[PDB]
Curated annotation (Swiss-Prot), chain A:
The chain holds residues 27 to 158 of 159 of the full protein. The gene is JCHAIN. One of its GO terms (molecular function) is immunoglobulin receptor binding. It comes from Homo sapiens (Human). Keywords: Disulfide bond, Glycoprotein, Pyrrolidone carboxylic acid, Secreted, Signal. This is Immunoglobulin J chain. Part of the secretory IgA (sIgA) complex that consists of two, four or five IgA monomers, and two additional non-Ig polypeptides, namely the JCHAIN and the secretory component (the proteolytic product of PIGR). Part of the secretory IgM (sIgM) complex that consists of five IgM monomers, and two additional non-Ig polypeptides, namely the JCHAIN and the secretory component (the proteolytic product of PIGR). JCHAIN-containing IgM interacts (via CH4 domain) with FCRM (via Ig-like domain).
From Swiss-Prot, chain B:
Coiled coil: none annotated. This is Immunoglobulin heavy constant mu. The basic structural unit of both sIgM and mIgM molecules consists of two identical heavy chains and two identical light chains; disulfide-linked. N-terminal variable regions of the heavy and light chains form the antigen binding sites, whereas the C-terminal constant regions of the heavy chains interact with immune receptors to mediate effector functions. One of its GO terms (cellular component) is IgM B cell receptor complex. The gene is IGHM. Keywords: Adaptive immunity, Cell membrane, Disulfide bond, Glycoprotein, Immunity, Immunoglobulin, Immunoglobulin domain, Membrane, Secreted, Transmembrane, Transmembrane helix.
From Swiss-Prot, chain C:
N-glycosylated; important for IgM secretion and its localization at the plasma membrane. The interaction with FCMR is glycan-independent. Disulfide bonds join C23-C82, C130-C192. This is Immunoglobulin heavy constant mu. Constant region of immunoglobulin heavy chains. Immunoglobulins, also known as antibodies, are membrane-bound or secreted glycoproteins produced by B lymphocytes. In the recognition phase of humoral immunity, the membrane-bound immunoglobulins serve as receptors which, upon binding of a specific antigen, trigger the clonal expansion and differentiation of B lymphocytes into immunoglobulins-secreting plasma cells. Secreted immunoglobulins mediate the effector phase of humoral immunity, which results in the elimination of bound antigens. Residues 1-102 are annotated as: CH3. It comes from Homo sapiens.
From Swiss-Prot, chains E, F:
Interacts (via Ig-like domain) with IGHM (via CH4/Cmu4 domain), both secreted and membrane-bound IgM; the interaction is glycan-independent and multivalent theoretically involving up to eight binding sites for the IgM pentamer. Residues 23-28 are annotated as: CDR1. This is Immunoglobulin mu Fc receptor. Expressed by CD19-positive B cells and CD4-positive and CD8-positive T cell populations in primary and secondary lymphoid tissues (at protein level). Among B cell subsets, detected in a subset of bone marrow pro- and pre-B cells, in most follicular and memory B cells and in a small subset of germinal center B cells (at protein level). Expressed at lower levels in CD56-positive NK cells (at protein level). Expressed in lymph nodes, lung, thymus and kidneys. Very weak expression detected in spleen, liver, heart, and salivary gland. The lineage of its organism: Eukaryota, Metazoa, Chordata, Craniata, Vertebrata. Phosphorylated on both Tyr and Ser residues. O-glycosylated. Sialylated. O-linked glycans regulate trafficking to the plasma membrane. It comes from Homo sapiens (Human). Changing R95A: Displays reduced interaction with IgM. It is found in: Cell membrane; Early endosome membrane; Golgi apparatus, trans-Golgi network membrane; Lysosome membrane. Residues 89-98 are annotated as: CDR3. The gene is FCMR.
Amino acid sequence: RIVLVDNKCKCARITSRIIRSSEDPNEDIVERNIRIIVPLNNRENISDPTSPLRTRFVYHLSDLCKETCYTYDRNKCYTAVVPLVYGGETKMVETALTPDACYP
Amino acid sequence: IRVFAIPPSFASIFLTKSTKLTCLVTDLTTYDSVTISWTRQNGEAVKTHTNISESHPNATFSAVGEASICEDDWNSGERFTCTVTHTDLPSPLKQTISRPKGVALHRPDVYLLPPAREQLNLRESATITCLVTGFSPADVFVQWMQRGQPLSPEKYVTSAPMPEPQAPGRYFAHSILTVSEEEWNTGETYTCVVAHEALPNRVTERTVDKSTGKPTLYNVSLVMSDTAG
Amino acid sequence: IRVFAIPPSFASIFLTKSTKLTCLVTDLTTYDSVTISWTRQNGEAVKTHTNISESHPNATFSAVGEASICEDDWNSGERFTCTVTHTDLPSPLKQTISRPKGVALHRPDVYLLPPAREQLNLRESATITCLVTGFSPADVFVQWMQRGQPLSPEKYVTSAPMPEPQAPGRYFAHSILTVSEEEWNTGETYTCVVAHEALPNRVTERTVDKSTGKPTLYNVSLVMS
Amino acid sequence: REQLNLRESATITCLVTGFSPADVFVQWMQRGQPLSPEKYVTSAPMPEPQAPGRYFAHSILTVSEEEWNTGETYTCVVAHEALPNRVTERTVDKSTGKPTLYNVSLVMS
Amino acid sequence: RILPEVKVEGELGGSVTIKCPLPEMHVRIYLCREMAGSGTCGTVVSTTNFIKAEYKGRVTLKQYPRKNLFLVEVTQLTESDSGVYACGAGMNTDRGKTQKVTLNVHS
Amino acid sequence: RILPEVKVEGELGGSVTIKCPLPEMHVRIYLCREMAGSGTCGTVVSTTNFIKAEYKGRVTLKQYPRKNLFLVEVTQLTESDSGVYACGAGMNTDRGKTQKVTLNVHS
C-alpha cells in the first residue's frame, strides 16, 4: 500500500499496512514489507561488463525512496559500443545490452 | 583449370562500405591475356578489374575480375556472370552469381561456452567457443577480441555452416580459440562478435571471463541498512 | 571409363564389426557380361558379389561388388585389386587399394560443453556440444547414448574434421545434440562416446547432467543494524 | 571418511554387479592414461546371492590421501561382451557427492 | 499481473483459439504452459520453428498486424489437463509473460 | 503426465493383466507400485530377475514386440489394495514412468 518507492534499479518495494486486527481496541500493527531482488550475478558497472563481479549489495532505505543500480528496466535501455579489426580499419559499432527493450 | 564465383560477404558489404563481386581463376597454367570480364543478365558489360596480381609458388596463375555494383541491385537478385576466356579453353567459361529469393530471414543466436573445468586441469590451454545457430541461410564472418583490442584470424578458427537437425533450412556454425590457459586464468576477458543481416543493428556480441562462467563460490552479503529510514 | 575403389572407414568398420570393400564403376557403358573380382596380395578369392545396379541417365554401368573379408588382415597391410573387364574396356585394368600404415597417431581428447546458461531461460531447445581435439588421423566416430541407448543419427550432427593452425597434423571436430529443455531440466544423463585409432582403449566416453554446474557453496550473510 | 582420517591411503572400490557370463576386465585410468596392474587389485567372479547364473566382482585402487584431496579424478573402465559398446566406464573425484553448503551468517548489532 | 481469464471449450474435434497482445516488436512471441510438477513455465510454441514433440502438427500461430494481435490455434485437443497458458514476448520466458489464461477441454 | 486409468474388480482367483507401452528395443522396463507412506514409487518387478518378496511367484511378464505391448500378469490377488502402479523404463525409476494406473480388488 503505502510504498511509493518501487524503484526497479535497487528492486525495493517497502510498503506499509495496518493490521485491521481482531476487533479489540486500536492494538494495531505497523509493517515495513521489503522485497529486494538481488541480481547477484550481475556486474559492478551496470553498463560495462569489463567491471568485476559485484559482490557487495548495499541497501539504504533513503535513496531507494526517490545513481548506480543493479538491474535493468523494461522501459529504459543500456547500450554499448564495440570495435573490430576486419583487417586494418576499425569502426565503432553500436550494440544494445537490452534487447526487446530498445531494439530500433 | 578452375574459376570461382565469389559473391561479396556480408561482412565485406557492411564493413568495407564498398560492394563488389569478384571471380577468381585458379589451377590453370601461368599464362597471360586472360579475358576475365563481368557482365549483367542483359549481356551489358560492367566496369573492369584492377591490379592483376602475381602468380602462386605452385606454378599456377591467379587472377581476379571485380565489378562494383550497388547494394540495392545486389539485393535485387540480378543474374551477374563472370566470363573467363583464354586459348586454354576453346569455349569461354561462365560463372553465375545472383540472389535467389525464397529464403526466410531468421535472427542468429550466438552463444558463448567457456572451456570445461577439467579442460583447465592439463594446464596448457583454454578453449572458448561461440556457436551461431538458427540464422537465415546467409553465411557470415566472425570477429573476436580481448580487452577491447580485436584479434587476428591466425588463432581462432570458425566452422562451415551446416543444416540444423530439426530446422527446415536454419543453419549453424562454430568458432573456437585455444589460447594460453594462464591468459584466461589471469582474466583477459574475451568477446565474440558477429555480423548478420537478420540482426537489427546488423552486429551482435557476447563476452565471457572467469566471473561470467559458473561462479563456484560467492560471498554475497545483502547488508540492508537504516532499515527504518 | 574408370573403376574407383572405396576403403571402408574405421568409423563404419567399428560399428558394423564387418569389413567389406567395393569398387565403383563410373562411365562404363550400361552393358552386361562384365568381369569383376577382388584379388588379394596372394590372389586369394573373396566372397560373392551381389546388388548390381540399374541403368543410369548418363549411360553408365556401376557393377558394384561387395565381399566379406576379415579384420586383422587389413591391419596387416595387404593390398586389394578390383579386376574389371568390360565390353567397352577389353583391356583388363588393375585397381589398387590398401591400408596406409604411414601416419603417426596421437590420442584424441574429449570435452563435453553443456548448454549456455542464457539458453536455459528461453525454454525452447537446449544444445550439448561434444568437442574432440588433438587427434592425428582424419577418422573419428562420435555417437551419443542416453539412458543406455544410442540416439537417432538425425538427433546429433557431427562436422568433418578440421585442422588446428596451432597444432600441425592434428584435426578437430564437434558433435552437437539438440534436446528439449524439460528433459534437460529433469535429471537426465547424456553421454558422448567416441571411438578412435590412437586412443589407449578403443573407446572413450564423457557424460554430463544438470546436477554438475551447481555452485559448491554460498556465503550469504544479511548483516543488518 | 573414517578411512580419510589417518590420511594414509584411500581405497576406491569399483563394484561390478549383475553381469553374465563369468568374464570381465577392469582397468583404472587416470587423466586418460592407464595405471600399473600392481597398484589396483581385482577379485574373481563370485556368484550373486539372490541371482543364480549372474556373478559379481570387486576392484580396489589404493591412492595416497593428498591426491584424492586435490580432487584429481579417477576412471574405472569395464570391458565385457554384453556391453552395447563392449566398453563402459565411470568417473569419481572429491566433489562427486558434495552438495551445496549455504554457510549463512546473520548479524544485527 | 493481468488475468485475462478465458474459458474456451474444445474436444478432440474442437479447435481452440487463444488471443494474445502483439506488441508488433517481432523479436519473439510465444505461448508457455506453466509446469505444475516443476512449478515453472514451459514453452509450447514461439516465433522460432520449435514445437513440442507431443504437440507436433496440432498447434499453429497467426499474426495480425492489422489488429496488432496474436492467435494460438489448436486444431485437436487430446484431453490434456489444460493448465495455465501464458502469452509472452521476448527471449526470456518467465520475465516476458504478459497475460495468462486457463480453460477446459471437456466441458 | 498421462493418466491411462484402467481398473478391475479383483479377488483371489482372478488374474489381472496390465498393459504398458513397450518403450521399444530394451531399456529396463518395469512396473512400479507407489509407496503411500514414503510418498514415492517402489519397484515390484523389472527387466532383471527381481521380484518383490510378497509378490514372489505371483507376478509374470510378457513382452509383445508384435503389438509393442508389455503385459504384467498377476495370477492371484488378495488384500493388496490396488494403489498406484506405474509402467516405466530406463535405469532411474521415478524418471521413467507413464501409465499411472489404479484398480480396486474387492469390487
